[PDB]
Every structure is written in C-alpha cells, then in structure tokens.
C-alpha cells in the first residue's frame, strides 16, 4: 500500500519544504508531493489509481496516476488535503474544506503538522460518533 504514495516534489523556490515529509474531484498524482489524506470524519489515506478504481504502485510516476477523491465519499461532510509539487497545501470540500470540522478545530492525522504547521499549538481531543451509520474514532485538534 506504501507504493501508492505520489512522490513528485520540485523545490524550485529553494524553501526546503520537503523536510517534514521524511469541491473534491480528481487530482493528478503528478502534482502531489506525499500522501493524500481525506477526512470521512476519520482520516483516510488515498492511494494512486488509474481512471478506473484500480490501485497503481508506481509512486505516482505515471501521468495517468490520479486520486479518486469524489469516489471516496460516504451525505456527510467531506474534505481532503495534500501537499502539491511546489510545497503548497491544497484542499477541497464544501465545515471546512480540509480537516477543519469546526472553524477552530482540525482532524489530527499523521501529517497534520506538515500540511498545517501553524496547528502545532492546538489541543487534542478524543472524538467518537456515528456518522452515516459507521462509528468514527479520531482525534480533533482545536485552539
């Protein structure tokens, strides 16, 4: 499952953003640097696929490797985040458009501080609820 990580990064601006690496439609893996996280309440890692829902294991090298974000949906709130090739946190969704459940809360996931370095000072909270019929256990980071 790890070979489905789009690893396309181009630090042409000499910022060194890649250090911490070590409307949701279809995003091209050729423009993604690192894992893609979607938040069906709980965070879900999205792997590379083709135009069909078939996973690919080429580290996002093929120009036909994409992430089917719209297919990964429960009528519940939805959103995804990822780092694009030049180091800009990209989002999509409607509740916020990323891991932002509350305007001041955020879904904690293993790459929260790399996509959102300013959320390090937030407090974790254990959340458990039934959304759309499934129980969701995750942590929320709020001010």
């Amino acid at each position: 499952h790890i070979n489905r990580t789009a690893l396309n990064c181009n630090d042409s601006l000499q910022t060194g953003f890649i250090t911490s690496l070590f409307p949701c439609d279809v995003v091209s893996a050729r423009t993604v640097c690192g894992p893609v996280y979607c938040f069906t309440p709980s965070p879900v890692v999205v792997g590379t696929t083709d135009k069909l829902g078939i996973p690919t294991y080429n580290w996002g090298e093929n120009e036909t490797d994409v992430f089917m974000l719209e297919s990964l949906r429960p009528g519940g709130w939805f959103g995804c985040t990822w780092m694009n090739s030049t180091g800009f946190t990209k989002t999509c969704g409607a509740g916020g458009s990323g891991p932002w459940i509350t305007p001041r809360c955020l879904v904690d996931y293993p790459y929260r501080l790399w996509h959102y370095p300013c959320t390090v000072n937030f407090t974790l909270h254990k959340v458990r609820m039934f959304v759309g019929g499934i129980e969701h256990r995750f942590d929320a980071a709020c001010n």
Epitope: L7, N8, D11, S12, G16, W59, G60
Partner: antibody, heavy 125, light 109 residues
C-alpha cells in the same frame, strides 16, 4: 560524516553487502549509491528514500543490485550480486540535499552531501 | 545518458595562479542542476558549487563556477596549497545522473 562498512574482498560470481550508517537523525532522507573505479570517474548505481522505501536503480545494474534500508539500525544497504572484475571499485554513500530537491516518482536528485568515507570492494579469485 | 567531458585531464599550476577547469556536456543541461566536487586521495568527494554558480556553505570565495547549456567552467582565482586535488562536475537534471572524468590540479615547482 556517514559511516560505511570496511573493505571487502570476494571471488567472482559472489555478492557483497555494503552498509552505510549515519549518526544524525536524517536517516529517512534520500540516499544515493555511487562507485568509482581506479581509472574512471564516479558512476551512479541507485538510491533509496528510507522514509517510504522507494528504490530507483541505474539501467546498468537493474538486475544485479538491490538497495535496502533498515530503520532499526541507522543503515542503508547496497547489495551487488554476481560480481565481476569490473565491479572492483570504491563504493560511496551520500545524502541527496533537501533544499532545491527534485523528486520524480520517488527518484530524488540534487547535489550530494554529506558523504561516507567509502568502501573498497575488491573482486579477485 | 548525458556525457560530461572535462578538460584538461591534468592542470599543473603554482600556488597563487588562477585555475580554470572546463566541463562540456553532450546535451544542453539546465544551469540549475550542475555541481562541482573536490576530491583528495583517500577521501570522499566534497561539494563546492551547486546550480553551476552558488557556492556551498563553508567554501572559500576564490572558488566560483559559471556557464550554461553545454559548456561549464569552475574557477579557482588564487590557488592555495590545499586546493590541489582532482575535481569532478556532476549533472543532476536528467534521469541517469552522471559525472565527468577527473581534472587533476597539481602543484607546479
């Protein structure tokens, strides 16, 4: 700098396993293997990004080499099989710089620093 | 594979003189992905220039590189005794990264 294994001497047709350990916490960052024969310059062999395990190889050693990394130790490995007398060289281990890095499908390329002290691999019968 | 040719094979200069080393590529490489390295006998190569122009942290000012396209040059304006060694040019913009053959700077007496 980076610590590599000592000198090795193996018969033709055998296989070597050269280690490369670093003291810093930059182990997960991309590493690159390069060898240098006596009369020639530096020759790229392959690389690995230990954070994800991506291995990219040069076309020459596509079926003869396998590069691995162990996260428990601080060591990335280069394993060259079916040795020949041409493979007698000094094998080097260096980190790919992060600032200004270019990564295409898991192959990270940039200037190389820091380096390991090198590993002499002698292939003789 | 991009072929990197260095010239001359050996440069014999006295301490204080100017050394200019050349690196010529077969393809037109991008000036942002050329590096120069210094290597002394027994030791590992040390990086001097990256991006064909920028000096590495800890490299004296007398080292300097320039060039674009196929022809690149490294200049040591005032040779010091510890500058005498072999030098290598590397390109890291094409899928198989390549190095040139060594240019050895040697003390003239």
């Amino acid at each position: 700098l980076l610590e590599q294994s000592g000198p090795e001497v193996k018969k033709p047709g055998s296989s070597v396993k050269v280690s490369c350990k670093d003291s810093g916490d930059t182990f997960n960052e991309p590493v690159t293997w390069v060898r240098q024969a006596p009369g020639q310059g530096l020759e790229w062999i392959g690389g690995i990004i230990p954070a994800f395990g991506v291995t990219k190889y040069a076309q020459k050693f596509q079926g003869r080499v396998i590069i691995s990394a162990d996260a428990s130790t601080a060591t990335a490995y280069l394993e060259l099989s079916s040795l020949r007398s041409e493979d007698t060289a000094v094998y080097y281990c260096a980190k790919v710089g992060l600032r200004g890095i270019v990564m295409v499908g898991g192959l990270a390329m940039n200037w190389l620093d820091p380096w390991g002290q090198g590993t002499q691999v002698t292939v003789s019968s | 594979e991009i072929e990197l040719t260095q010239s001359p094979g050996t440069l014999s200069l006295s301490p204080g003189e100017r050394a200019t080393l050349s690196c010529r590529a077969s393809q037109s490489v991008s000036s942002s992905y050329l590096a120069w390295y210094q290597q002394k006998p027994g030791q590992a190569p040390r990086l001097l220039i990256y991006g064909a122009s920028s000096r590495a942290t800890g490299i004296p000012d007398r080292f300097s590189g320039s060039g674009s396209g196929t022809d690149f040059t490294l200049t040591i304006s005032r040779l010091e005794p510890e500058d005498f060694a072999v030098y290598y040019c590397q390109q890291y913009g094409s899928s198989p990264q390549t190095f040139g053959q060594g240019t050895k700077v040697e003390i003239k007496r």
